[PDB]
Design a binder for this molecule. Sequence first.
Ligand SMILES: [Mg+2]
Ligand SMILES: [Mg+2]
Ligand SMILES: [Mg+2]
Ligand SMILES: [Mg+2]
Ligand SMILES: [Zn+2]
Ligand SMILES: [Zn+2]
Ligand SMILES: [Zn+2]
Lengths: 97, 48, 93, 34, 126, 49, 312, 257
Amino acid sequence: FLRGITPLLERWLGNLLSRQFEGRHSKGVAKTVTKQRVESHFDLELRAAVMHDILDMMPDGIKQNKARVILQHLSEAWRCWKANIPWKVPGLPTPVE
Amino acid sequence: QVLRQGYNMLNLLIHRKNLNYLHLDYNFNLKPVKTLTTKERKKSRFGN
Amino acid sequence: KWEESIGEIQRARSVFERALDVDHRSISIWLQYAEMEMRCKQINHARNVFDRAITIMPRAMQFWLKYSYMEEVIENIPGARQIFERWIEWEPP
Amino acid sequence: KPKRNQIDYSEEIPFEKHVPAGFHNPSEDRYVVE
Amino acid sequence: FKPESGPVNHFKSEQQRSQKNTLTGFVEPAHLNEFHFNRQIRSFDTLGYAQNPTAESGTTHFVGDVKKAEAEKGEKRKRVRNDDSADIDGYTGPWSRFIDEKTVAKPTPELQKQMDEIVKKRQEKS
Amino acid sequence: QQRIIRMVEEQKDPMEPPKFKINQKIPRAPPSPPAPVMHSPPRKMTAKD
Amino acid sequence: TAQRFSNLMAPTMVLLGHEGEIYTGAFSPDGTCLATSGYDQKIFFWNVYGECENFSTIKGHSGAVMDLKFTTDSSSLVSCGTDKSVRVWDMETGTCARRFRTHTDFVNAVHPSRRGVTLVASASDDGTCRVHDMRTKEPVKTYTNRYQQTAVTFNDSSDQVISGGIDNVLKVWDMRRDEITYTLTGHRDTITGISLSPSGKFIISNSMDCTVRQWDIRPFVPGQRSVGVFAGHNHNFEKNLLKCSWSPCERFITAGSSDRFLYVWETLSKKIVYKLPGHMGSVNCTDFHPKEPIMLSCGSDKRVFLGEIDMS
Amino acid sequence: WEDSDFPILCETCLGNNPYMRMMKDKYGRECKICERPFTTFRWQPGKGARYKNTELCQTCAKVKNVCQTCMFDLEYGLPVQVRDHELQIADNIPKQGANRDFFLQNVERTLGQGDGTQPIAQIANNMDQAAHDRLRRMGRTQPYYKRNAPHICSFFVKGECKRGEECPYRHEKPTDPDDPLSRQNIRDRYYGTNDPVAEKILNRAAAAPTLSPPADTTITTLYIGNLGPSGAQQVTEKDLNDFFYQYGDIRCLRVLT
RNA sequence: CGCUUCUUCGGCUUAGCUAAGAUC
RNA sequence: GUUCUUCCGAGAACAUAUACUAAAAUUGGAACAAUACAGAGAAGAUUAGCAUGGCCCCUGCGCAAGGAUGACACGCAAAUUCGUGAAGCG
Ligand SMILES: [Mg+2]
Ligand SMILES: [Mg+2]
Ligand SMILES: [Mg+2]
Ligand SMILES: [Mg+2]
Ligand SMILES: [Zn+2]
Ligand SMILES: [Zn+2]
Ligand SMILES: [Zn+2]
């Protein structure tokens, strides 16, 4: 038992000691995505991809603040799908729609 | 000696963390010497 | 702007320099950084700000207009000519 | 009350980015403080 | 090795014109003989002179107190030994003191009085 | 003209833990100065656009 | 692109693997390889061309190898050291052909006879020159000088032994007379190496006085035998036996230097032609490749440097 | 973290013996001025000295052009406060922790674009040749070695040095604690603020005699003396001509041999 | 030919997701 | 200090540079226990949970997970600029 637990505790007590002396550097370590966190992470990367498509799609010379309104139209278009309401925004530009 | 060393060495780790309300007795039982606040009982939760 | 209003011009400069590290393509920051220098009669600072702006964003007309206009209002009209000449070297609109 | 977890931003210019060198000597500008 | 032609800066000092690699001089790795290196340290430390360490030393063959180097080219106290190994209390092998050995040092009362007020002035800060 | 020095390396104690705190965090170095933007001239938007 | 002067793989090559101060280095007369040794007691062999791979490494000395020379036919390497012994190493076998166990102190220098029967002149801290003949255990000649002898060579006819040492004067011993027929006086301090010109007319001799003096060793000389003096190199407090060597065309001379620089002088003008940097300690031994313009230099820094030079 | 082959030090810290033994310890100390861990070097400058070691890291040496132990300027051997005064280098260097850690990072980036042989711009490129002369004419020329002697023995101040003549520390009078030279701080001496020894230098340098023109603005005449006696020791009229037409148009030169 | 009051024209900038998050 | 030399009180060899040198004296820097007060995320209430950001930590062996979703966020968000006619004047 001790043969194999020796390197394990050597590492573990090292990590214990090192944060006890060096402090805990771990700010900005990459949090991985796990069971409960998947569904919020999908919404991050969706809205980021949507936003990137918005900014590339709009021509040069437009007030960018329109982009945050388009993300609202996305959220309404989803709820209408979820609730099976027919979604149609009358003035929405056809590339945006 | 190895027991004196190990005993001292765990006591220093307790005191390094200022957990002076914990006591490590000579058979290495770790006793809280007082009833613990949520702060103290969180702060003193040593790991594996 | 607030550091300028308190008279802390050197602080105000560094704040605009730190703003430009965040977005160096913001025409508003270069103009507001320029205008505050020429409000404060810091004409050699203002000239350096404009030379950087037109060096970094040669296609933004607002820098060339504001710079050549400043150099004209300040009656350095051969300075104004050379700004227009340097502009025309970019074959502008 | 004493504070020490941060720089006092009023003591010295925080994270001071110095203005680059340019062709016009900046020291000819004389400014009078308000 | 053809020298650089032309004048030299009036403004920079000779320290500032000098060839350099770090902020203060030309650091470069070296491989001496370990034995002779040690010999030269101890000659400088103990005698006041040593052979010159520079490459291209020229005429300056000796460094330090060169007067001794040219003159000389390059008593001890007694110890109260008691090597009687059976003398359990009395034996002093390597730990034989000098017979002179002033095993405690105390200042004169004049120096004591001056230094007494110094610690008091330090302590009177409270 | 020259010194020559023996540089030994001081022995590290293997039983000594990390000496200094490095949980410090400071702002990133400022970016390297702006590369000129080098665009094609603006294409005029009509109000129709 | 740039001019090239040899079949070297690069204009300068750095040869690495020695573990101590390299006191000595020599090319094979055929030009194929070079052998180097010193305080690390191993003798390293290197090819002059291609990768310069360390194709062999002789071992056997129980002391520093102070000096090391090839026999003229390149079939054997003579070497001598602080183990009071001269050894002759067979090249094809890599083995100690002979071990002249008869010196009573450190052997500082060795030189094999150029032609005829193979004889090995050696000089030692016992004060004696000895000439050893391969065929006999006993030396042919023992020339007891009073003070430690640091350098030795035959003349070209291999019938005079030239030596120098702590007394600074070079002795020339005439092997049919067993007398010093003449001495060469002029060095201010102890001699560190002697080397014989390809034609045999001249010797150079390096000394801790930081000069190389060229001497005329021909049988008849109409006057003074001192031909000239070279300077520029330096001997430091390490007091190494800095060697010296001749270019195979005799137009150029080299000597070891403590100032890290590899010095070449032109024999006729006495001007320094090369003062190459690159070593980090005493350049103890220097030699020329026998057929091609390549320089060998061996440092106290455990580095050997091979490189081209324009021998114009 | 920062590392190097050799420390930035002045010759009085290294001692007169040109052969030295020195120990390197990577990250072995934190810099007294910025707490960054730095490669430490430790040496004894000749017999009778104590073991000295580097106190500043190299960035803090470069950002003031100071010796890493004694923190005097590397050119003139003066304290920073004297040199920063004469060169008009203000107290520009940030001092607050996160602020000056950020500053030092940019210094190290900037100097890393150079050749490694220069301090920061402010002092690498200062050109006031008159100010350089004022500094040269007050910097100590000889290396003062007494600043490497051992510390004074506190047990000797207590009157009870139980080691006697085996004690390596000094058995002699402390500096009187009323003298401001006894009360120094590494930060004061580094940033150059309230430094006692600087003020004792600046005052004595200011008290030195000087030329100053008279109120007679019509006077443009200079007396010149110490010309020696007449003959081969005397300077010729050509000598003054060549030296002084450098500065301006002489109207007349009168020689009185 | 110039200054001021007033209206008047273009511009005039919702902080995610989950089983409407769940329940009355 | 030892193995040897002898003209005899000296000489040869072996042996070769420890120590952050302190029994000290000085000088910064963290959390502690609780009298009375009013008391802890989301367009009424009971209010989940998971995300997002930086010069914010703590427990944890930890790219696991907890610490109130660990705390905060919580609106002057203008930031490249105008154009108009009546009526007083003078
Ligand atoms: Mg909750
Ligand atoms: Mg959590
Ligand atoms: Mg929770
Ligand atoms: Mg949270
Ligand atoms: Zn530092
Ligand atoms: Zn110093
Ligand atoms: Zn003492």
